[PDB]
Each structure stands twice: as C-alpha cells, then as structure tokens.
Symmetry: C4
Subunit: 326 residues, 4 copies
Amino acid sequence: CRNRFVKKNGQCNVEFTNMDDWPQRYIADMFTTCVDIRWRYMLLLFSLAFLVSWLLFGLIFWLIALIHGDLENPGGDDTFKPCVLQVNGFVAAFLFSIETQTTIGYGFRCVTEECPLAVFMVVVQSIVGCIIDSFMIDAIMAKMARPKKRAQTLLFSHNAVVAMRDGKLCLMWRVGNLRKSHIVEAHVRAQLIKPRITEEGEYIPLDQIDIDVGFDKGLDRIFLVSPITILHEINEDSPLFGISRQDLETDDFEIVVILEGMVEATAMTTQARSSYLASEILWGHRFEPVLFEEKNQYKVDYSHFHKTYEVPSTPRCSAKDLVENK
Amino acid sequence: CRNRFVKKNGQCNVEFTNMDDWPQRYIADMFTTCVDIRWRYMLLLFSLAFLVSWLLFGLIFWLIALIHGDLENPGGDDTFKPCVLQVNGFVAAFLFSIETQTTIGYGFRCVTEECPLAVFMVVVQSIVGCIIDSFMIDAIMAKMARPKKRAQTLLFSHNAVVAMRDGKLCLMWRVGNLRKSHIVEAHVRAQLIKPRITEEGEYIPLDQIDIDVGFDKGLDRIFLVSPITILHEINEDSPLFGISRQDLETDDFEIVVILEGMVEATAMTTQARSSYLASEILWGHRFEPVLFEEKNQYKVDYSHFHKTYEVPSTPRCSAKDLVENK
Amino acid sequence: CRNRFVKKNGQCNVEFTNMDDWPQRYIADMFTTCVDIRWRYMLLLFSLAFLVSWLLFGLIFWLIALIHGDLENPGGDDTFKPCVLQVNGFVAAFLFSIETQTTIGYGFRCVTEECPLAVFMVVVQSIVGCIIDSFMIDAIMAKMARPKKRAQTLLFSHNAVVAMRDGKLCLMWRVGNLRKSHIVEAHVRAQLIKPRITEEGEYIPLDQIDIDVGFDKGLDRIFLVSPITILHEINEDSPLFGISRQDLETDDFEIVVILEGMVEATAMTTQARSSYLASEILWGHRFEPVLFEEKNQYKVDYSHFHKTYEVPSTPRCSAKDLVENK
Amino acid sequence: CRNRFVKKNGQCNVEFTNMDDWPQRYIADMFTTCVDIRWRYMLLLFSLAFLVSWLLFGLIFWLIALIHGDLENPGGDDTFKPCVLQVNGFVAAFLFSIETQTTIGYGFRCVTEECPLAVFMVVVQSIVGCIIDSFMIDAIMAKMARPKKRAQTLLFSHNAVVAMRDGKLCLMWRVGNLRKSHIVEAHVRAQLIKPRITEEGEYIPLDQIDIDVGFDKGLDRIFLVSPITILHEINEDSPLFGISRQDLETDDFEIVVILEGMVEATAMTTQARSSYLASEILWGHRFEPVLFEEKNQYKVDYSHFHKTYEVPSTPRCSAKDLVENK
Ligand SMILES: [K+]
Ligand SMILES: [K+]
Ligand SMILES: [K+]
Ligand SMILES: [K+]
Ligand SMILES: [K+]
Ligand SMILES: [K+]
C-alpha cells in the first residue's frame, strides 16, 4: 500500500519544504544551481547575459557619441574626428557593441584614437566578453557532460526474485549495460526501506537497512560485460531472514537497488537506481538466460532480460524456518 | 573552554607560520594558487595579462612604424607602403594590437605584405593570444567548478545527541541535502579531538581519534535522499565509553564530523564539515522527525531539522557503567 | 575449445542483440553516444552542424535581401540603404552568414542599422554560434581526453604461471607501465570465467568467480614503478584448489585480469584488461627478472618481460592434494 | 649502500629499456604523450600546427589566385572579379589564411562570391581552425591542471623515527599541508623495499612489502589540517619485527611512503611520495610539536616540522625481543 520512496526509473519521490534560507545558499553554490536548471532556462539565462552586456556597452558608446557630438558628424572630416566611426544612433552603437564583444568587428563602425574613454570601453568590453564567454562555455560544457544521463543506458530488471542457489535462499535482481563502453569501478548496493519503531519507542519514518551483497569480501564489485544477476544470500544477518512467501505477498516494504561506477569515456561516477516493492518480488522464480555461445563470440538476447520462470522445488518458508528445521 | 579546531560552518581554525620557502613551492604549484586566490584578484590578474600583452605588442608595432617611417605617411601612397596601415601614433598601435590579439580586427588599421617583421609579430601575437586565452578560460573554468561550494547546500545539525537506540547507548547527529541532485558515493566520518599525554609522557597537542560510524561493515556509506541520522554506538572500543552525562557537561573535547561524496552534476568530491564541542552535545535527547507520508509522495519539513526533544528514560551513566552493572 | 569472453588486448567479445528501444535511450544519453562514435563520424557530424547553421542563416539573410529589394541595389545609395551591404545573391548571403557566425567578419558584407530583423538575426546567429562552438569544443575535448587510451601503454604478460612461492602454490601474472607517469590509486582484480550448473540445476552461461589477489588486506593495491608480479595464492578458498597440472592441460576455463588506476596527468580512471585461457597458463614456470641494479639507478629490461623458465621442483598435483598429503 | 628506488622528493629512480614498440603505443595513446612532454616542446608543437595550417591554406589560396589570374589584377574591376580581393603574392595569401583561420579577418584581403573553390577553402579552413583550436586549448588546459604539481605543497619529514607510543614500539613519520585548501579523501601507504630470495630460491630484485598503517580499520584515512604523525605499530605481522637499533644502523633497506588524496579545488587525485633509507631512520627519537594553542585559534610552526629529540627510555632491542622477554 504505502507509496514508494524511489521509482522504477531511479527518480527519488521526496519533496523538500520549509527550506526557507535556500536562495542565499543556492547563490553561494551558484555553479551547481546553473548546471541543474533545465536547458531552456540556461540557454535563455546566457542569451540574457550577452544581450544585457551588449545593450549596456551599446548605451555607453552612444552616450560618448552624444556628448562628443558624433551623432551630427559620424563619418568625421578633415577637422573633426569621432570616437567611433559611424555611430549615428542607438542601433549603430548597439551594432558596434555586438561587433566588438563577439569580436565579429565588421569595421564599418570602428573605434578611433581620439577618445581615451572609448578606447577604455573597448578594452573593458573585450575583457568582459572573454569572461562571459568562459562562463557560458563552461556551464554548457559541464551540463553537457553530466554523467547521470548514463543511467538511461544502464538497466535494472523490472522484478527481483527469491530462489535457491548453491544451497542458500537468495534474493536476486539483474543489471545490464546497453553500451559497448564499460562501467569502470562498478559496484552495487541495496537497502530495505520501511518505517520502524525502536524498542525505546522512537518512530523512524523510513529506516534504511543494508542488504548485504558481498561488500565484506569485495564481491559487491562487479565486472559487467553481459548482464549479471546480483545475489543477496538471505541468512541470519539479513533483514529478510524471517520473510516467507506468504509474508512477502501481504507485507509492505521496499528494496532500493543502486549501481555505481564510472562512465568509461569521461571517468565520472554515475549512480543508476531502481526499486522493488514487496509485491514486485517474485518468490520461487529465476531469470531466463540471455548469454549464449556463438561460433566466434558470445551474444546477449536483451528480449529475455526481464523474463522469469517458476521453480516448484523452491521452499515456501522463510530462511529462518529453513535452518530452524534442519 | 579550549577554542575549537574546526567551526560549525566547516572552516578549519588553524594558521600556518614559519613556512618560509612557500613562494618557490607555490610557483611550482601555480595552477593551484591561481584557483584559490579570490575572484577579484584573479579577474584582475588576467586583466593585467591582456593589458600587458596588448601594450607590449602595441609598442613593437609602434617601433616598427617609427623605424619604417610610417608615422609620417601612415596611409601610404603609390610609392610608399607602410608595415601596418593607419598606425599613426601609440594609441593606433595599441588599437591594432588589441584588434589583432582579441581578433576583433576592425581593419582600418591593417597589416601589409611589406614588413616580414610585422608579419612575424602578427603571427607571434596570434599564437600568444591563443595561449593566454586558454590560461584565462581554464582558470575561470576550474575556479567556477570548485565543488567545495556544494557544502553550502549540505547541512549538519547544530547539535549532536546521546540516546538509546535498539538497546545501545549512541552518539547521534544529522545530515541533510538541500538539493534535488544527489551526493554520489556519499559516506561519513567522525573524530574526537583533544590534547593527550601518552603513557611515555609525549604531549600530542591535538590527537585525532576515530569515531566509529560503521566503516568495517560499509555502513559509513549512506544513500541520503531525506535527512539521515548518523549513529555512533558507544561501546568498549569507543573513546566515549566512560563518558557519562555529568562528565559531558564539565568535559572539554570536540567531535569533528565529515560528509564526503560527489556532486552528481560534475562528479567531483566535496567534503562538508562541522563540529560539536562537549557543551553542544545534548545528553538524553533525540531529533524530531522531518519525513512524513503524503498522498502520492514523501515530504521533508526542514523547519524541524535541528529540533530535539528529551527522553527521561535515557540512562545518565556512561556506557561502561551501563555494561559494568548488567 | 570454448571461445573466449575477453581477448588478450582487453577487448570484450560480446555482442548485444534485441536491444530494441536503444535509440530513445541513446538520445537521452547523447553526450555519451557522441564521444564513443569514432573520430571520422564525429568531425563530420560537427562539420554538418556548422554547414547547416551557415546555410540556414544564409537563406534567411537572402530572404530579407530579396524582400527588402537589396538584390537590385546591394551597395545602396543616398536614398536607399540595404539591410546588409553587398548581399547580392545566395553565395554572398552564405558568405555573410559564415563571416558572422565564425566571427571572421571581413566586413565588405556588413549588417546595417536599417532592418531590425537583420539585426535580430545577427544577434541570434552570434548566440547560436557560441552554443554550437561550445558543443563541438567539448565533444572534441572529452573524446580527446578519453583515458581508455592509457591501456595501450600498460602491459599484461602473454602468459600466467603456476609455481611455489614462500611455501604456497600460486597463480601468477605480470603487469607493467610503459611510461614515466604513474598510475595513481592502482589496484588489481581477477576472475575465473566458466559455465556452471548449480546443485539446483540452474545453468549459468558464464559465471564470474573472484580470484583473490589480496583485497581483504589491501594488498590488491599496488604501487608499480617497475613491473610487478601479481600473486593468487591457490588455497582452500580458491576455485583452482583442485586443479593440478594434468587438469590444466585438458580443462576449459578463462582467467580475466584487470588493472584499474588513474592516469597521473588527468586523474581519470583507466581499466586495462587481458585474459588467460587454461591452455595459456604455464604450470611449473616462473618469470625472468627485468629489474637490475645500476651505478646510480635501476633499470627495467622490457625484452625479458614476457619470458619464463621452468622449475622442476614444482609439484604437479593440485593444492588440495598438496595439503591432503602433508 | 644499495642506491634508492625512490628519492626524497618523490621521484622514482627507474629507467625503462628495450621497450622497442613504444612509438606505436605512444601514438595510440597520444593525448597522454602530449600532456607529459614539457611545456616548451608542447607550445612549440602547437605553434607548428598553426604555422603549418596557415602555410598550407596560404599556398592553396595562392594557387587559386595564380590560376584565376588574380595576381595580375588583384583589386579587380568592372569586368574582372578575383576569388580573393588583394591576394597579390604569397605573403598576401599567407596573410589572408592567418586572417581567416585566426578569424582576425582585417578584410582588406577578402573572399568573393566568384570562386566556389575559394568559398570551399574558407569553409574547410574555418572548420579546421576550430578543430585545431580545440586540440590546443585542451592540451594546454589538461597540462595546466595536472594535479601532480600539488605534491610540491605537501610535505613529508626528512626523517622517520622509531619510538614507543602507548606501550607499542612504532615506526613514525610526519606529513603536512602547505596550503589552506584541504586534501580530500586523504589516505596513506607505506612499503618496505629490499631484494629477497624465496625459500624456493627465486630472486626478487626489489620485493615490495606492505607497511601496515591502519588499512583494516580505515585508520589509513586521515583528515590533515595541522601536520600529522603517521604510525606503523611494529608487531609480529610487521616486517620490522626483528629489527633492533643495532640492526637498523647496519642494515640495507628502504621505506617508501605515499600520501594520496584529492586537490580540493579540482577534486583530482595527487600522489605525494618520499623515502627513508635504513640510515635515515632515527631510533629512539620523537618529533617536536608544531601545533600550539593561541587566543582564538591554533597555529603551526613549520620551522619545527622536521626537528626531532632523543628518548633514552626507548628500548634498543627489536619488537620481537621486546615481547619474547615479557
Ligand atoms: K573583422
Ligand atoms: K574542461
Ligand atoms: K573579426
Ligand atoms: K573592414
Ligand atoms: K574573431
Ligand atoms: K573587418
């Protein structure tokens, strides 16, 4: 029943409220804010930064021309020389500004030697334009690179299963790579999520309890070429020790699964996520194989990635009762 | 009493003195120096690099024009052709330099085919301008990206508490994320800081003693969506084993807490810090919940993040006496 | 017999099929796709992005000139002023577009103050050109940096060997650095690859079984200056415990070896790989030394890197029988 | 006597010879080569790339002008229009090439609409110039960022010492940060380096044997604000277990020390190194303190960083004999 902490696609279902002092923090941590806000708003924010600087300097060059009297004699002559040739109005001043900062510089409109202030504005604008260009480029460059996107081409199975492997009752789920490029330093985690009351009567809204998948022997570290089935041996130390098939079909909990590792190309860590409600766990099932031998290679059939099949010999009791008996 | 090693905001309160050979080291490690020095001074340092190069080449082009006799006939004619059209003085030479290096190139001032030296300067300046532009861009790009800034949007609680959980006396503190973007490969550390004399009579000004929060089982690794309460079970192996409530209110020590993990966007490791003096630790208290169930999601009420409430049933004695008795 | 999971050069021999929904995923994870597709196609893709944008804006400027009547009077006069000087046809419009977006801006063709639409196109194109330039630069920058390339200058030996060291039967293989720059945070892994049927009758096409090389004591972490010989002590916990020399020469399995660590320069993790078929493992052999003392240094003779030599005293039985006897 | 594997400044003293196939590998791993070769040669290599491309296209534009007959009528007239205005010789063609690729584009020399080949060269050169600019920028950007440089501002002590702490005989050495910016995820390693013959008579030129500094409890992980003294408890599992003071003064071995961690700014892992010959280890000594209490802070006196002082109560026998007796 209880709605889920994290969805099948990995997105976490939690909203933060009464975080009143956030704008001051988001300002101090601005580069972070900027790479998170969605494309449309960023490209717009940087369009504004150009437009604003272009209009700003455009105005200054216009003022200089207004004061110097260039608007009445913009081409100059033998006696009179303007600060900037051909600034005859605001649009021309705007054009000169864009031409200068972009560094297009068609040159019909052109700064002269006459006005040290105009020369200074060209100096300052050039330097400002380099700074702004850097900021844009960077933000775009960072945002482009964001390795969270790699989780789209990493795949968890829709279902987890419980079944016997090598004499032990195990929780299992599957993970796969939809690319030729590897996930480097790849390793996995899992957590049981449920509310809990401590023996001292403390209510934990959602306690996160570790699901052991081999950390202590380094077996949480995986080298995934073809899809792999992750194993959680359900034993005395597991929080599913007393969970039988009957319990599972009526119980209310969640199992969050995580795959972390580096995108081979950029060597930046991504974190793929998914989840399994107690209802989505299939007792007495196993995954259908996807790897098979070829003439000169192996092949993975991703059509059979999510598919499972029942195993009647699977005990229906919990792992506690399975050992309590024998 | 004793002033603190690290402040609540994470900044470390230590000054380095008699580090006499630092400038030679800071030069060899220059990129590091440059990204650390504050914005104002960096933007100024790069403004100078442009201005210096602009003035430098400006001077050379002026000298060439002076020697070649272009200052007396800058437009040239049927018989005489200058090295650079329209370099009539220093300002013009300066303008040509800026126009060339920025690559604005209005073109009224324009290099000719006549002087192999002028042609060589345009070649060298162009190449110098690319180098300098790279250096600026980079520094700005690095400095912009600095992931320490992410610690502003990560939150430790103002207080740590001591209380019973699941039959064990525990030190606790809370950590939270003020963003939707995750901290990847997130994990926590803690250290007790105090002076110490060894049995051999050695004085350690500030010994740093580990506060176990689950490293040996990988439980120091956390997946924080909603705020989490970090647990240090106070047992025989803990350095707070013999610390009772009475001791805590009169004792003088510090507990430094660290949260490390990667900014999801850039996948760069940040290190959030805070601290708790013995006085700031609240014995017999617990944190008020912030996570609650909604219709279709969960919600975190950050107004109640720092709030605590007393628990009278909490034993007042140390964990040593708690086990010495039973 | 069975063909190998991963080749000597580290490339994995697996093809993914029936991955039907890949284009939608590869689009959402586009930056990843782009850095993977080989140079030729990327440089072409970015050549198209310029050409397309250049043609696009070229067409718009031409339309403006067509409508405004500039094609009949492109230089303008005392009464008539064009939107863009000297746009006399499509090629001229194309030239103006390239000149503007590249920001070359020769200026013979030059935007005027007359047409707010032309002024707007110059604004939009400039901003589009900055965006596109960023995307190109980035992709090229990422692709250039790709640290997988570092595996070319890291070397596994062609053969693994089995031999006695310090009273224990050990699997061994060698690793080496072909550069002066180090591999930082370097560490090693190994896995036995073979098909397997579980006692419950489940077929695992290729189970991956850990080959212990010292993870639990941190001895998998290596500091490689000169070549190093990696050791897998074959003991009760090893999956080669019951493998004797006779078994090895007739058995069918694979040993995949991995060296992970960061390129000192970029501090990006690379993952060098190789493999050993059961046939490629030389029982009763040891590697010939390559490090020798010099006058003022040490020297590595990479000619003798792969060379081995037999040791008759090596027991021919498995490590199980070696301990079963004594 | 035997010369040392790694020097006090961290540089490793090993030369690689008979690495015959290196150029083909260094080519495949080119980005790596490029960032390693020293500044002077890189800046020169990129100067050549510009010069080469500038000369190349310069030549093509000249050929076009030669064939089209522009060299005889470079300004054009009412009947004749050149491919590129004012290309009157090679220097002019060279100038036009530089002007175009740099995108300075003074414009006196200017491509026309006349020659589709000239228009194509401007297109191709622009695109080539963007590519080359990217390569340069990148290389410079990577090389600039190289985090090895951070090891200059990290400090090992000149000496290691042996002394008693808390009832155990310990090897000790000191590490320090010469910056305000932290080393994130900082941790330490150590290795004993000496030649060795195995009981099976195998000669290991330089075996590397781990010096335990707390890996198994995570105590190798350090949070260094002020300088820290690293401890290696010399016990039964240590390879210095049977080393007494007398042995140390006549013995021949080396102790390599490593500090790894991320530069806070760039979050890139650096690896500081140093070494101690058996002669450089001071038995019965301890380091002088450098941290002392101030009014409102702490202060580190780096003048006393390397200084030690004797402790007569230090046992002169090995840790083996120290426990063999009691
Ligand atoms: K121009
Ligand atoms: K970058
Ligand atoms: K220009
Ligand atoms: K011009
Ligand atoms: K330009
Ligand atoms: K121009």
